[model samples]
Target: DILVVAALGRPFTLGMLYDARNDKLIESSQPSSAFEIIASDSTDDKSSLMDIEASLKASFLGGLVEVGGSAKYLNNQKKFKNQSRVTLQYKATTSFKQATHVVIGILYGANAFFVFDSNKVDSTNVQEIQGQMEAVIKKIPSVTGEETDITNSFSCEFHGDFFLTTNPTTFEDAVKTYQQLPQMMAVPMTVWLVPMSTPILRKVRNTLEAIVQVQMRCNDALDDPTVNLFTEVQKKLSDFQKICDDHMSKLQATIAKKLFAIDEDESALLNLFEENLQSPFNIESLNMWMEFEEREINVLRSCMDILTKAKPKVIFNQGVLFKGLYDSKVKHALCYVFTNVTKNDVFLNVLNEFLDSPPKKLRPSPKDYWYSYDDIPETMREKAYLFRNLAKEMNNRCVHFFVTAIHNPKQEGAGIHYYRESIQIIDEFTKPYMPGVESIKDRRELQWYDCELTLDPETAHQVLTLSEGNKKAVSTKSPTDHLEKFSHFQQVMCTKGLSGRHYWELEWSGYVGAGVTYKGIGRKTSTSDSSLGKNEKSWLFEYSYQQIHNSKKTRVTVSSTGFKLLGVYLDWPAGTLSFYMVNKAWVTHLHTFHTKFNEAVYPAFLIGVNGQIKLL
Candidate 1:
């Protein structure tokens, strides 16, 4: 018969007998078991002991178990050859004042100790040894049960032994030296029996949920009658849907791959954890929490991308006056909504959840178009000013609703707030563009301008190369047989501008001749008289190594070494042309020509050998 003894403290003991081979408990003595006595006596001590026991069990099961040594005497001469024998012991305590101890007392006891140098074991070998130990522990009959709790906390250590021949000269001396050594052995063999799961699946679930919430908000906005900006917003929403679908498919595939690594029926383990585990340990609950977090964070980022794409800039005509000025107001409403929403706690929370934080750079252009009502036409100025205020109101409402819904997640009424505000803003902004207004056809046209002019290839000299989107012209270094076609001048003309003040700047490099290299013209009769200021039909500010030929026919001496850019402004109706030397941001007035225009004028450029000019 194998005796199982549990001693709580001094003068308190419990005994039981078990058949080790058949795994059956034969008998048990009801002699003041710690669990029963403490529980029956005082409520406070009992509660504290239970809580301490649970905490200790969890800590030990997660990490290592400490072992000690002691010797005791047992009655019953029939079973024991010697009354006193060494017992290897385990103890755990919360406060160190109150402790619980247990005896291993089975199989190897006094003779089980062995020692080896821990420093000799490399990390790789240590892991291999750990894996081997885990396999052995898993195979134990008592630990193999389906209901068994695998703590993975238990560890075994081999201690250095003292021999009589080495130092102590007697058995008593050797035993004393061994017992006096540290309780924690030098060489430890640890095994972790616990099964752990990664946080990826949890995060995936949260991200999916957040995407769903944002999608729902977008859908509601789409259905709202007030939102007339559905054309652009709908396209963005479609793109977002595609992104979500692709991401979800990949996420699911990854989950399957991770589960496959377990080499068991994945569903069985998942179900077991879901159905049997309590809070904090419950797999399903943790998964749900992670799913929420991931979804919210991803959805927030997607919204930010959509907002960035919607940022607006003013459309200007004649390089100064507003064109489609009211249209910018509508776009501003969206910008306002996005800007305000981003400032709230919900947006910040989502941003902080990401590993690489969002950029803090300000928008490059002005948020609102700056202009005076006196600058706008009287009829449209009042409406435009009123529309600006209306757009602001709508934007405020949108931000208020979005913040409420996102912050609370349960405000059912606030769900439609963004939709309603968006609809109102778009509907009101587009009303002026609708049919039946006489001014609709007369409104200033919105045109995007660029200093990069397209060279008219039909008028280009054969020896001149125009490239970089026809914005740069270079005179070929090699002499060409077709030079006669250009009449000894390598030049190109810009397409004619009939109406409005046209302005463009040119950046020049390399050599210059006595004649002007660039000029503005009324008309070109032939290539013979088209060399800048050399002809009566053209007016130009000519630059040479030491002198500038003004359109007034007077030559002035100036430093020409550092000249880089030239700005030309032509007023067609006024029939006046002005030129300035562009020195960085400061423009120095070079010349002005007052001429009577007979026809629409075009810009002509001349490039000397090894020289280049680029329209900026």
Candidate 2:
């Protein structure tokens, strides 16, 4: 019996219950006729204003008060017109006689007021009640007198004893009832009293929406497309499925909690709230929560279209970039009569594929044609005509695939897949175009040793500035320069010490001398000691666009490209120090020095031309 709902017969009724012992309120509203009219009379001036005192001698509440101040004023209200209706509240103790409960009010509309009780009164407190009636009368809001005294406007109505107003305060029962009982506060209209812990249900609704999204993406996968990359796509689609299945199952279990109940007081509310939340507010909404799923599906659909279109354009863009590379080459490649190529199998495969079905649109400026360059304008005319011709020479698809292979973009390095972590190929179009670098198991040969290169400031030169996490040495002079550093040469050595086989790469412009030396390769005053290649204790490759190899020439690959990056690999016990020219997807050997070293060596650098060098 934690709750009971009731209504008082009045113009407006209040609900719930009160503990009279705790001074808590609860109740209904039957005002005028609810109490007996023991005396009906008039009040003229202040005379009949004590009118209530004499009447109460026969009424119930008169026995309740011996002291004037003991009756408390408990409630009040609004100013309608000039008359303010203050619903007054009072209560008092009784000897062997009167009240179990008592109430009082001012009815401005009837031009009168009242005192009510749930029981009868006796003569003992009649005089005292009279004294207090004047006190209550004096405290009333200013009343109008005239109509022939205060008596014309004022009529006294003593209704029988029954509570006119009592408040229902204190929360436990009310709060708990409102928790789940929808009807407690509901009448002809609607108010579904919800509990405080509603966010839990909301979160569940949110997750269910996510579940439906997973279902759709996974559903697309069910009609397995035996597309070009079936093995890969199916596995991924299956993977997406299992995860979606797993997701659906997880929230299925999640929705199960919604099906069950929680802590009783709130649990009852929790379940009822779930039903309402599930009810699908209106038919058009298709259930509010399901519409939420619809909301997200709209978002997902748009996002899916975005990536679907943007990705093809990006790869198509790289093809355009490669087109420039081809155009620039034709301007010169035919002059030398040699097309650019590498022996690396993957690189060769893409080359041969494009060569086998060579597209009609090679370049706007092809030199080795059936004829030489037309006399100036004639040549310009041919080039300009080719330039304007939209290269629909073959399926535009073929050229994009060719360039997709040629560019063979790195997923980690830059562009769309610009991430720090490396990724792998999972498509047929990409597999044959994979790098010469193999998987880690067989790739141990060309695999990166990942040496963190840090320059030794002590060996750093007077004109060099180290930056980019100390991975670069730039030919920039600063006021913070030091003489404790190398005094003559623009040279520096990294603090990274290596043993056995090690590998590293450097990217730079102009001239750079890359080498290896012992830490104590004479960091003193000798000019040769300060120089990498000049010193006999170190081995260095001094490289640039010109004067690349001195004394004995090193092997050169395709001369079509300039040397801007170099890869250095060292095998100490094998007496091998090799340097390779590194392109985007392939590395070709440029030079090798078979020499013995007595100790572990450190990577060193010497620069020229105000350019900078960085570890890759």
Candidate 3:
């Protein structure tokens, strides 16, 4: 067998030799010399003994070569004690020429090995030969003073020419042999192990902690009463955003540096850190807080306007005009106005003073004792009108107050129950001021009230069906069989209406009697008196033979031959209810009823069998 060895240090060497068939060293009975050492300054000590040791061991253990046998020796007493011994089994096709080249290549590449050659050898003299080989192996010094450096030494060798001559049949085996070549060639290796406290990671944690602190401060600012609501909130949000941006800039730099160290692209690494940082950096909560504050300021400003205009004298002067029988009505209107005023601190003070004392007596009794609308003096009449107009104005402002309250931004977090209470209050405050039949007037002349009108289903006659958002009613049968149930007609009323004037239109088919019915206004009463124009309590316009009827049981003939459209104008304050026979272009004077309306009244409809009436 042939042996090759090399050493790595200031200079490098390679030598050739022989070994016994049993792989023991052969002793020289007669003087004999080993192969000449091949030295080269080109090789350096940078390739540590550990590198050589690991490379040689990897060649054989990694299946790079077939080994017949191997042995290893270590000496802790010397530098670079890490070493290995390998025996080779050549392929059948391998010649001495190929083996010699393989042996020379392995030794020269390792830069660390010991070669022993003996010319005279026999089995009996094996101990002397081994003793000499051990001395030479022991002479190799450690590459470094540190035990760790020497301990890491490793080496291995195999018949390289065998692989070259008979290549591995499979790709994996071929790759394996190719990979092992670098390990056995003493190539320097590099592996990076990053620490948990890298600058990027530490900065990320610190930035997150700083952001948490900023968020806490922002929340504190919102709860702080002394702070200007809008300004402070705006500043805090801006500060928080700045902190986020600053940290993100720092994180970008750190990520770039980290990726560059590994010679890697920044696309995935940049995305990973950005996504990670973005999760906790959201500003949604801050934005919501700011929006709520702004809305509160707006509502407060509107309420403040009401507070500035509300005065005790103005309210008291309006209150004193209601005397005697009008006192209750006066107080009722004042109640609606003051109820909304109490919601704000500034207005509540004014409201209290106005209600602190009873209203003083201001007007004397009329000579006629006001038995009728015409009996009151003109001055008293004018004052009464002024008071009513004042009430209307107060009611308008009150409506604004309640609407603002219901839609206040502060109420957003108050849940459903809060909104329910607000709406209920609105309903109670506005109920008394709401117009009755006594107040309905001409659509063009009255103070119009806007309302959402729907048919009252409970009041709908069984024969009358309501559809199309409760705005439409169709009668399937006449009232002949159901007379006891107001069976003369099918009737339905609106859900609610204002004491102020309200006007809606109804379209009817040109067919008379069967196509259109009666339209009027009345209170809920017994069936005997509910028919339009049949009793004093109701006023209606009936369509029969193209003639319109008034509540006084009077009829008027019109220029138009057939009328499918009618307009009813009620002026309760004027004690008059007028009906008109109308076409698209002209309105013919029909009939007008003059009488006082004393109660709340709803728009009423009378539908006959196959008769349909719709309120526009």
TM-score of each model, paired residue for residue: 0.29, 0.28, 0.29
User: What digit string (tens of lDDT, one per residue) describes model 3 on residues 334-419?
Assistant: 21121111112221122223223311112111221121123222332333333344444444311121111122333221111111
lDDT of each: 0.35, 0.38, 0.35
- Model 2, 507-601: lDDT tens per residue? 87766778787766565566665556555567777655221221233433446355777777776777777767776646676666777787888
Query: After superposing candidate 2, which stretches have Cα over 4 Å from the reference?
Result: 1-445, 479-484, 544-561
The candidate scoring highest on lDDT is: 2
Q: Which ten residues in a row have the lowest lDDT in candidate 3?
A: 73-82
Question: CA shift at 560, candidate 3, in angstroms?
Answer: 4.7
On residues 1-616, what C-alpha lDDT tens digit does candidate 1 reach at each position? 2233222111211222322111112211111111111101121232233232332222222222122222111100111111111112222221101012222232111211211111123335545443443443333222134312221222222222212234332223333444543332211111111111434334433434444445434443334332222223334334444444444444344444444344555565355334323322123322333333333333333333333333323221213212222333222222112111121222222223321231221211112211112222232333333434433323321122111112222321111121221243332233222222111121111000112356666556766787887778777344443322344566567755434345567877765322222333323345436565655655555454322233335654345545877666665567656555666435555555566665666676766636677876
Candidate 3 wrong stretches, greater than 4 Å: 1-215, 219-484, 489-500, 510-530, 545-551, 555-594, 608-610
Task: Quote the lDDT for 143 in model 2.
Answer: 20
lDDT of 2: 0.38
Model 3 lDDT at residue 181: 38
